[PDB]
Amino acid sequence: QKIHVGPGELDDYYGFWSGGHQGEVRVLGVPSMRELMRIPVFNVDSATGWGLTNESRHIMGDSAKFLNGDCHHPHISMTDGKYDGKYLFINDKANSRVARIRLDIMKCDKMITVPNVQAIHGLRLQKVPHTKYVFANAEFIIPHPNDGKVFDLQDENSYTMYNAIDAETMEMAFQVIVDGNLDNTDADYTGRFAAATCYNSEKAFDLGGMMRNERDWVVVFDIHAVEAAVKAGDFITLGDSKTPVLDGRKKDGKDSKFTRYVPVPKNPHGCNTSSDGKYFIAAGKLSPTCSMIAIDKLPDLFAGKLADPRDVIVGEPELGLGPLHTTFDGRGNAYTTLFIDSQVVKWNMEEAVRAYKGEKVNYIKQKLDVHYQPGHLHASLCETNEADGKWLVALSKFSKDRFLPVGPLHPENDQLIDISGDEMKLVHDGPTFAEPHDCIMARRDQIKTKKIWDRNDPFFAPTVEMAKKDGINLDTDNKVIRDGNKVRVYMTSMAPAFGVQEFTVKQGDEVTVTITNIDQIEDVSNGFVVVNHGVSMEISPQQTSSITFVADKPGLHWYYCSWFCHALHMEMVGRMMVEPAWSHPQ
Amino acid sequence: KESKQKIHVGPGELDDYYGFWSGGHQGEVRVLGVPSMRELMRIPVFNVDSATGWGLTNESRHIMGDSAKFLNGDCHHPHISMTDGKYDGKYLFINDKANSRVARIRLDIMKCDKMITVPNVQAIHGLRLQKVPHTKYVFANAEFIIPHPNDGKVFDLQDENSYTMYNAIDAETMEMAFQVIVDGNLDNTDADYTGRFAAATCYNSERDWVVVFDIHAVEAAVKAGDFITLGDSKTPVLDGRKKDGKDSKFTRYVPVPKNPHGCNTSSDGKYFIAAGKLSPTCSMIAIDKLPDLFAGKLADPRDVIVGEPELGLGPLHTTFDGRGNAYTTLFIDSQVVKWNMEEAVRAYKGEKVNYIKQKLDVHYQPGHLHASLCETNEADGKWLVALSKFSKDRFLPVGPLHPENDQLIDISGDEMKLVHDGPTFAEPHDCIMARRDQIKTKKIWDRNDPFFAPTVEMAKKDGINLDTDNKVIRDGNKVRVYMTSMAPAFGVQEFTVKQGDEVTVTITNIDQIEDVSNGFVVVNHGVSMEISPQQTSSITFVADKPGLHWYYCSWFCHALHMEMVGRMMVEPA
């Protein structure tokens, strides 16, 4: 299996890395592991203007006031258990958001702040019949309402919730109150069941408390029952949110219609569906095991045909110290990160299941040393029924001496491992910034991108509507619209010239500049920077982009095209002239 | 001799050079390993960095000063400080064209530690360092002509008080040293190997020129008090314009075709080489003739030109292997051309000599290029990076935006060989390499480090010993939390405030194990920062929402990382 991609060759896979607490999504080529693109999501990007432009701030809504994010879990939309390459979704733990990225333009196109929760951590997508719902965990228990009268986590109204977002509209679909808390989550291959690990069944706030219980659990959700309850109008609502809220807590030992709690040790972390649809696999973390939940047994569990929730567990292989996450090669083998032992352990799920029945057999096939302290791992197409068993990436949190010293802050080490054969082979050390937690790979032919924008694209449709109110045709017009103390400049751009090369405003005017790049050649991006005003944005071919700033400085102020576009790039400039306040009224 | 160097750095092996890439329009600096071309670290400078809190923390906003209000930057030209014409590994400097700044990075901690807004100019673009006897001055070009004063009374760019200026910053204090008014507009700049001379291309005389500065004469004028000041800046300003055809004393204007661009000093110190851009040539200025030029011993400013090789369409920039060759990017022809400087000089006198050695195709439209140690008299002729603006089909498609293609070229032998295509984001533009042994970094912070000294001072006023204390100080509607942190526990795990209070959280990571970084995020408050071992970091926000609000450690630091959390309780008003 070729490891190196030479000049003029292309990678075989796309890789979508989370940006960690840096807040972006990174697009890598695999197996070269080179970064092809950064997709700003929760960060402010000086280069494209994301978080400065009117289009981006409209997508972010009120959360445009935050300059930070913390993302962990990127996932690609599916149809019938296979990637369809339309959307990628990712969480924000820092400000409790979920974002959707459109894979054809590789931009964030929708974002939602999840109501009545703190900290979106785990996220995964419905697999079958297609990604109708995005499932997201809120990690921290809070009071409801959270108005500062009650702070106690033990109050009957202190809880966290499992969240379902409608993937196509990016509005809330429902929320399910749970006992304990939520960590990671996955979904079955039927659409009926989802599952999440919980580490704080104690509802404590201190370290000792959260480790008190021998087992926490994985909570299993019957989504068909939740939908049935929503259609029956049997739910409540919290605060000013109209999201249906259903109660999945145990009420004095009686289970909810919506949930069942399977005891699992101990502060379990990863929650992964095997690619054959047979198991939810929960990594035991503080327990040196994984727990294997038989998805075929869940209907019987929800029908009261099982005496004990543990009856749905059909294996608990002892793997090593600090199991965190599991992935699958599609040949019947599972691969699990051991954080403390600092290894990846390859094991055979069916032999694990036989050993739980007492049939002594060695289900452990190989342990590979990794460098050092691995968190997530991901095998190519592992989240689909097309898991192809070629590449594995283990994302390690301490790189120590694996790279040149760069000061007190070290890179993460994302290691590429060949699993096409019976023996795992470590082939590449990839340093990365800001702690990617997880990543997802797709075949080159599962992703189709646009090279030029459509003029009706929803990304800037609000800007086109604003232009219409001004009677502007964005494809041709170079006009300055004046409206009181507001000024709206509309121009075309066509390397190496701005369509409006000079305009005059009053000191204090609120200036919006809207640029439509009317080039036809792919790859001729234009930029727009206003010197010393904190204004920067990119405009690609056939895109309309706009940005608003206050002209608070009298005098002459240059603007220039930031993106190299032509041999005469450094001459694509213009002048804003600001008449002083003392020459105008007030 | 062949070009054979190994290009692959396998698991467990280390790169041989550091690469310092400009972050382009994204505004950071990037640290790469060469020859792997992998990104080891991101250093935030003009961008806001959610991961480390740069632009959010009190320490970073203090360094940024008033310019902390800007969320953007546009950088191009990174350069490492020198002693005796060799890298000394102390500082990296870089420009901000978007908001007219120069920043200094300390290479021992890989953080930006000083920043200056250059007064009375618009857009810092070209930038280079004094080489000899060391980097006393940072030289920076302001690109755009503006009125003086720029108060809205005059907009005419041909008014007698409309001009731009060459800028000298004191490298060690990061205060302005002096500015020199010039004719025309400035593009790129370089310095000689003595400290007396510097030079800059000008593209908008409206043949343009390379303006040469006699820095000794400028310094003499400043020491004698013969200068003016502009506006509310105390920076000495000297007039380097031609007045009625009379030369300044501080400057000479050397005619050079055409809209010249790059301005590069050869590593043997002999030449300033200006790339022709619209002219298919480079022009070679003999630095050893400059004293005679400023002494009025030469008939014509063209007499310092000793070579004008014809290279190809669209020469932009030049670098050096230290063996006597120059390497120039041809933007139009989309090539790197290798040529021999001494043979070009002899051709200029009329000898039939072929100075061109090889043309290598690159992909596509190269701008800057950089050979290893080329800015020093130690130029080693091993590696060459050409930074190409249009990558086209060289990488997988990723939508309407495309990556720059930074291509690594083996120049160790007699033939250039292309060995790697490196995609990069937001047009890094230029880069600089240093030997592994030229860079020495700290493993853990020193407690006396200037980076957070202002925070140690605040703590002093509160009577706080940052190394041990876990305390909440109340002062009106201000709340100052001080805590130590030690994975996996925050030293203060809960505190209570009033809605509306202005909260400052100061965290001191007292771990002594390298690489055990901590983070601090306050949920739904837009607060995020990093605290590495022995660092103190601080951040201020207002508690504007009543109720219970969790905070957590963002940096995976421990098996119990998920459980390293705290509670802020906000009492309603």
Ligand code: CUZ
């Ligand atoms: Cu957020 S957790 Cu194991 Cu996913 Cu990294």
Ligand code: CUA
């Ligand atoms: Cu438009 Cu460069």
Ligand code: CUA
């Ligand atoms: Cu402290 Cu993770």
Ligand SMILES: [Ca+2]
């Ligand atoms: Ca527990």
Ligand SMILES: [Ca+2]
């Ligand atoms: Ca000109």
Ligand SMILES: [Cl-]
């Ligand atoms: Cl998981």
Ligand SMILES: [Cl-]
């Ligand atoms: Cl240059």
Ligand SMILES: [Cl-]
């Ligand atoms: Cl040679």
Ligand SMILES: [K+]
């Ligand atoms: K790390």
Ligand code: NA
């Ligand atoms: Na939204």
Ligand code: NA
């Ligand atoms: Na400063």
Ligand SMILES: [Zn+2]
């Ligand atoms: Zn440049």
Ligand SMILES: [Zn+2]
């Ligand atoms: Zn250039």
